[PDB]
Ligand SMILES: NC(=O)c1ccc[n+]([C@@H]2O[C@H](COP(=O)([O-])OP(=O)(O)OC[C@H]3O[C@@H](n4cnc5c(N)ncnc54)[C@H](O)[C@@H]3O)[C@@H](O)[C@H]2O)c1
């Protein structure tokens with residue numbers, strides 16, 4: 001039994017109050033589903049900028065009526081200090097996921113990304129701190145590694161940001177560290193590495209590669225590969241990311257004011273992904289015979305990204321049990337039902 | 341003749357349009373005085389948050405009526421993108437000084453500091469970029485060195501921030517670098533090291549050590565030393581900082597998208613400063629016989645700060661001609677006239 005498995009068993013016995021910002025988004029709604037199923041009490045904050053009411057509706061259809069009543073939802077904005085203080089009222093653990101992802105988005109509109117990702121992040125720290133919360137866990141990013149080529153990726157060795165988005169995610173780490181030095185408010189930042197799974201928005205022009213591609217194959221549209229397709233990623237199935245969050249939310253002091261890489265330590269080239277998704281969809285009765293259409297590399301894009309999760313395994317007892325294949329197998333059916 | 345001296349002679353012959361944000365503040369009004377005297381055209385942006393109309397009035401009394409008419413003032417906020425675009429209209433060189441200094445201030449109120457220092461800074465980059473400006477120079481800070489003990493300070497070796505303020509100043513560098521990578525908008529950031537001189541506000545609870553102490557001695561109040569007084573600084577007289585600004589605003593491409601240390605490479609302990617100011621005031625007919633009152637170190641304060649200006653001397657031809665003594669001698673008379 002891993003530390004998470006035992007935690008899964010302990011939580012329902014000693015229920016706590018959790019706060020999930022960006023609860024209507026991909027990662028947020030998944031965290032919600034898991035916590036409500038662990039009979040925890042959850043408060044959610046979201047403004048629907050990129051999240052959806054359907055994500056909340058889907059969760060309700062997946063959890064028991066009782067567990068769903070343990071959920072309090074607040075339609076607010078983390079850029080509004082009032083909404084933050086409100087969402088942190090009497091909360092035990094904060095899981096901050098509210099943000100505006102997508103490098104391309106931040107590049108053609110750095111101001112809008114800055115407002116939520118940095119101002120909003122800072123408001124949450126103050127509100128969480130002032131609410132005397134027990135723990136604060138926030139979504140960081142592997143983009144912080146920037147240009148630095150070296151592999152695997154180690155937490156202490158980072159490169160220079162390659163985009164506005166990357167800057168904001170790195171600033172979340174900076175402010176987190178300072179709040180620890182100046183107020184003794186320790187946090188735990190999780191550097192996610194390409195998370196995927198159910199409820200990750202396939203629509204919009206900034207959709208992630210997996211949702212975008214899976215959606216396109218089901219619809220029979222062309223699939224675009226930015227570059228030669230040799231670009232590699234450490235795709236982390238949602239379930240592994242959920243584990244890290246709960247783990248960080250309840251870690252010992254020795255593990256606080258620390259940032260961790262959250263992935264599986266695997267390497268998947270975009271070319272492998274194309275076939276993984278296509279074959280995965282084929283097992284579900286979806287035929288796709290189109291070849292991938294290769295176009296130019298995308299700006300502010302990283303070449304390779306492999307994570308060393310030994311720090312997370314060692315200090316948090318993080319033990320991911322889902323490789324890309326398992327995740328893809330679990331995800332594909334969902335998208336087919338979503339697009340039907 | 342230094343590169344600045346020749347630049348002093350060249351500018352009046354080929355006048356350019358300059359933009360100074362925070363033009364009503366200490367460093368900003370001094371830059372204004374110098375530029376107007378070099379017969380340059382200047383646009384100023386300020387909201388008087390910490391600046392003063394008197395600083396502008398003093399400048400008017402110091403420059404010719406003709407040179408003063410070459411000045412356009414805009415009462416605006418860099419947090420307002422409209423005001424930024426307005427201030428950058430048809431501008432050649434941008435000297436961004438608008439910000440909210442003071443570590444103590446950012447510590448007891450990180451949100452207010454974040455808004456101006458990061459959001460406002462980002463708006464200026466966009467507006468300067470969209471206005472097709474020829475150069476963008478911004479006020480950085482030696483605080484970016486943070487904890488790192490090593491001396492002298494070298495631009496490539498920085499430590500971890502010790503306060504919210506330090507974070508914002510470091511983020512100005514981050515966004516500046518990214519704007520160079522993504523838009524080809526190169527900038528030059530100047531890491532100032534404790535600037536002082538005429539018009540540096542002696543009032544308020546966040547006043548810098550020199551203005552605060554000088555003011556207190558003239559008034560006959562007690563002088564407080566936070567710590568043992570062995571805390572050392574590289575006090576940089578305003579005139580040296582002005583040189584760096586104009587130098588950076590007109591530097592060759594090889595010098596762009598680069599950050600520089602701006603000081604004199606000198607080391608002055610707070611204990612030496614106490615006597616430098618007191619003796620300096622004594623030469624002007626001001627008697628002070630009180631001994632300094634030592635109290636606890638101030639939070640988010642750096643122990644020692646010495647700068648290696650060789651990078652600035654080498655790439656910008658920076659050649660400061662004012663040590664603390666000269667600066668103090670020039671400053672003291674001003675404060676005596678200000679408090680009278
Ligand atoms: N998905 C990945 O692979 C990945 C990788 C690295 C980091 N992250 C981070 O994980 C977090 C969640 O990502 P996600 O993929 O679930 O995206 P998502 O867009 O599905 O979730 C983000 C949610 O935050 C909400 N939000 C945005 N701005 C808000 C504001 N100002 N006030 C209130 N709510 C606001 C949105 O409505 C949305 O529901 C983000 O912070 C992101 O930066 C994700």
Ligand SMILES: NC(=O)c1ccc[n+]([C@@H]2O[C@H](COP(=O)([O-])OP(=O)(O)OC[C@H]3O[C@@H](n4cnc5c(N)ncnc54)[C@H](O)[C@@H]3O)[C@@H](O)[C@H]2O)c1
Nearest residue numbers: 362364365366367387388389390391417418438439534535
């Ligand atoms: N003085 C030093 O020793 C020192 C050291 C390192 C960095 N700096 C930097 O130099 C710059 C100028 O410092 P200064 O000592 O002349 O301070 P100052 O307070 O005298 O000047 C700052 C000016 O900016 C204006 N301002 C602030 N927020 C604004 C906003 N949101 N919109 C428009 N105007 C705004 C203020 O009204 C003020 O006049 C600052 O950016 C500071 O961070 C100064």
Ligand SMILES: O=c1ccn([C@@H]2O[C@H](COP(=O)(O)OP(=O)(O)O[C@H]3O[C@H](CO)[C@@H](O)[C@H](O)[C@H]3O)[C@@H](O)[C@H]2O)c(=O)[nH]1
Nearest residue numbers: 101102103141142143194208209212224225226231298301
């Ligand atoms: O239609 C498409 C979409 C994407 N890609 C490529 O696939 C790779 C991955 O795309 P993406 O899912 O956007 O990954 P990232 O650029 O690593 O961004 C991920 O990681 C970022 C920082 O960690 C987060 O902000 C994003 O939410 C998350 O998608 C990139 O090389 C893209 O160029 C394609 O080839 N074709």
Ligand SMILES: O=c1ccn([C@@H]2O[C@H](COP(=O)(O)OP(=O)(O)O[C@H]3O[C@H](CO)[C@@H](O)[C@H](O)[C@H]3O)[C@@H](O)[C@H]2O)c(=O)[nH]1
Nearest residue numbers: 441442443481482483534548549552564565566571638641
């Ligand atoms: O009444 C006083 C005021 C200050 N100090 C000390 O004197 C030193 C210098 O004070 P200060 O002038 O506030 O210097 P910094 O803390 O280095 O801040 C300077 O450098 C910062 C970052 O570079 C800028 O934000 C500020 O505007 C600028 O004052 C510090 O150790 C203070 O503790 C005293 O002992 N007594």
